[PDB]
UniProtKB/Swiss-Prot annotation, chain B:
Gene designation: S
Subunit annotation: Binds to host ACE2. RBD also interacts with the N-linked glycan on 'Asn-90' of ACE2. Cleavage of S generates a polybasic C-terminal sequence on S1 that binds to host Neuropilin-1 (NRP1) and Neuropilin-2 (NRP2) receptors. Interacts with host integrin alpha-5/beta-1 (ITGA5:ITGB1) and with ACE2 in complex with integrin alpha-5/beta-1 (ITGA5:ITGB1). May interact via cytoplasmic c-terminus with M protein. May interact (via N-terminus) with host bilirubin and biliverdin, thereby preventing antibody binding to the SARS-CoV-2 spike NTD via an allosteric mechanism.
Organism: Severe acute respiratory syndrome coronavirus 2
Protein name stated in the entry: Spike protein S1
Lineage summary: Viruses, Riboviria, Orthornavirae, Pisuviricota, Pisoniviricetes
Top-level taxon of origin: Viruses
Record function comment: Attaches the virion to the cell membrane by interacting with host receptor, initiating the infection. The major receptor is host ACE2. When S2/S2' has been cleaved, binding to the receptor triggers direct fusion at the cell membrane. When S2/S2' has not been cleaved, binding to the receptor results in internalization of the virus by endocytosis using host TFRC and GRM2 and leading to fusion of the virion membrane with the host endosomal membrane. Alternatively, may use NRP1/NRP2 and integrin as entry receptors.
Glycan-carrying positions: 35
Curated annotation (Swiss-Prot), chain D:
Domain of life: Viruses
Quaternary assembly: Binds to host ACE2. RBD also interacts with the N-linked glycan on 'Asn-90' of ACE2. Cleavage of S generates a polybasic C-terminal sequence on S1 that binds to host Neuropilin-1 (NRP1) and Neuropilin-2 (NRP2) receptors. Interacts with host integrin alpha-5/beta-1 (ITGA5:ITGB1) and with ACE2 in complex with integrin alpha-5/beta-1 (ITGA5:ITGB1). May interact via cytoplasmic c-terminus with M protein. May interact (via N-terminus) with host bilirubin and biliverdin, thereby preventing antibody binding to the SARS-CoV-2 spike NTD via an allosteric mechanism.
Stretch of the intact protein here: 530 to 578 of 1273
Name of the protein in its database record: Spike protein S1
Encoding gene (name): S
Organism: Severe acute respiratory syndrome coronavirus 2
Function field: Attaches the virion to the cell membrane by interacting with host receptor, initiating the infection. The major receptor is host ACE2. When S2/S2' has been cleaved, binding to the receptor triggers direct fusion at the cell membrane. When S2/S2' has not been cleaved, binding to the receptor results in internalization of the virus by endocytosis using host TFRC and GRM2 and leading to fusion of the virion membrane with the host endosomal membrane. Alternatively, may use NRP1/NRP2 and integrin as entry receptors.
């Protein structure tokens, strides 16, 4: 990543993990 | 330079619309309470790090 | 000799009520059809 | 590029998905990136043209 030359940020890693979702009545994920 | 990502990295795996269902998918996610690589922004000249299976 | 005991205990015991066997039968029918659809 | 007819059993093909049924006007809201629509039984229930 580059920034603008003249903050508690993360970087994580993804893995094939099973996950159970919870869609609401709006079609978005609430849990 | 390590911290705890509480519940982060959850997204919509497909463009299907679903309403009030508990759907169970199996694909790439950032695991819950994972040890994500925290950084300081205030080393900092050239912070290169590998891309393995997607990054958050 | 104790009719008022019957009417009060009738109110209280149904008051404790307000269905394990019945909700089970509805649920087993629901999972049977849902596995059939997901096949 | 066919016109839209409703309240009648047709053989629709919306953006490369097969399926027959009768199309009805709805009121439920989508998200801007979402195209399909499914229920608990994992069948198509909605699609915007």
């Amino acid at each position: 990543t580059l920034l603008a030359l003249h903050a508690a940020y993360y970087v994580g890693y993804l893995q094939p993990r099973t996950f159970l979702l919870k869609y609401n009545e709006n079609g978005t994920i609430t849990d | 330079a390590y911290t705890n990502s509480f519940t982060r990295g959850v997204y919509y795996p497909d463009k299907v619309f679903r309403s009030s269902v508990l759907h169970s998918t199996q694909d790439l996610f950032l695991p819950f309470f994972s040890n994500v690589t925290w950084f300081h922004a205030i080393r900092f000249d050239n912070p290169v790090l590998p891309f393995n299976d997607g990054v958050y | 000799e104790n009719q008022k005991l019957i009417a009060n205990q009738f109110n209280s015991a149904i008051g404790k009520i307000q269905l394990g066997k019945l909700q089970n039968v509805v649920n087993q029918n629901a999972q049977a059809l849902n596995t059939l659809v997901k096949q | 590029s066919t016109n839209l007819v409703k309240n009648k059993c047709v053989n629709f093909n919306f953006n490369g998905l097969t399926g027959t049924g009768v199309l009805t006007e709805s009121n439920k809201k989508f998200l801007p990136f979402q195209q399909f629509g499914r229920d608990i039984a994992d069948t198509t229930d909605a699609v915007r043209d």
